[PDB]
């Protein structure tokens, strides 16, 4: 991450997310700033199961609900 940040201030970085970027992958793409997201891919840190379990119900049904282009493109993350 750090290297990528510095690198970013010095050279060109570009990143493409095809299926899903999890944890450090997500953070580096965002750090890379320039980000392409394939339809039906999703972009998350922690799984729907874990969150639903802590919250006592199936709030979310699909990781795409959480990180898909319908979220990140609609919020400018993608």
């Amino acid at each position: 991450a750090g290297e990528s940040s510095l690198a970013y201030n010095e050279i060109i970085t570009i990143s493409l997310v095809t299926c899903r970027a999890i944890g450090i992958g997500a953070y580096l793409v965002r750090l890379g700033q320039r980000t392409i997201q394939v339809e039906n891919s999703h972009l998350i840190l922690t799984g729907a199961g874990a969150l639903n379990k802590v919250l006592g119900r199936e709030v979310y049904t699909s990781n795409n609900q959480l990180g898909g282009i319908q979220i990140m493109h609609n919020n400018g993350v993608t």
Binding site: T46, G47, G49, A50, K53
Partner: protein, 77 residues
Amino acid sequence: GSVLEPEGTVEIKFRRKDLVKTMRRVDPVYIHLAERLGTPELSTAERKELENKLKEREEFLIPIYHQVAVQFADLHD
């Protein structure tokens, strides 16, 4: 501290299979049932009875063993 906190660790890596494994190593009752089912020339009564006794033992046993599992995961962290 961890890549993943213990509850989320258990969620992925401490399922039923592991519960069964754990009874067979540690639970005396489970051992006992298995010891008899592990006998040759058993009556179909004793066999069917043992399998039932096993399902009952396992489900009754379910609460404690989840906490032991999460504890175990956290100890890596």
